[PDB]
């Protein structure tokens, strides 16, 4: 298991901006080319892994139409925080958010799970 710290639950007031913290303490240094971060979302608990944020030496946003342009990245991974920021949270944004880490040279593949809840 990798040292990934994510809040399993986070509650946010509808219409507001929310930050989704994904932080790792993987011992090996971050090489931009080796390092991979992929961000997905689940409408229902066991729905499809709706990827929305790739990483290829830079922030690659799938730019989802359920997430038109309120999604931007909220960290500096070479300081080991990879959180993601959502502007103007809305109730379909309710669901599962997941951060998956890869830290070459390190072999192990990490996983973060955050369930975002939306207030009213």
Ligand X SMILES: *[C@@H]1O[C@H](CO)[C@@H](O)[C@H](O)[C@H]1NC(C)=O
Q: Interface with ligand X by CB under 6 A: which residues?
A: 36, 38, 100
- Nearest distance in Å: CB 82, ligand X: 12
**Among 11, 14, 16, 31, which residue sits at the site for other proteins (rule: CB under 8 A)?**
31
* Alpha-carbon torsion, ordered 10, 13, 14, 18, to 10 deg: -50
- Helix count (H) and strand count (E) of the chain? 0, 12
**Nearest approach, Cβ of 16 to other proteins (angstroms)?**
34
Tell me which of other proteins, ligand X, none is bound by residue 100, counting a contact when its beta carbon lies within the kind-specific cut-off of 5 to 8 angstroms. Answer: ligand X
From other proteins, ligand X, none, interface partner of 107 (C-beta below 5 to 8 A by class):
other proteins
| Least distance to ligand X, CB of residue 103, Å | 12
Q: How far apart are CA 27 and CA 72, in angstroms?
A: 26
Element (H, E) at 80: none
Contact yes or no for 7/113 (Cβ under 8 A): no
Strand partners, 101: 37
**Contact footprint for other proteins (CB under 8 A):** 27-28, 31, 105-107
């Amino acid at each position: 298991s990798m040292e990934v710290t994510v809040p399993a639950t986070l509650n946010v007031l509808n219409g507001s901006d929310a930050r989704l913290p994904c932080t790792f303490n993987s011992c090996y240094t971050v090489n931009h080319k080796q390092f991979s971060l992929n961000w997905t979302y689940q409408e229902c608990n066991n729905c499809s892994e709706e990827m929305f944020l790739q990483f290829r030496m830079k922030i690659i946003n799938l730019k989802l139409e359920r997430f038109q342009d309120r999604v931007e990245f909220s960290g500096n991974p070479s300081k080991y925080d990879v959180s993601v920021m959502l502007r103007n949270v809305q109730p379909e944004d309710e669901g599962i958010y997941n951060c998956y880490i890869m830290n070459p040279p390190d072999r192990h593949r990490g996983h973060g799970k955050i369930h975002l809840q939306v207030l009213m």
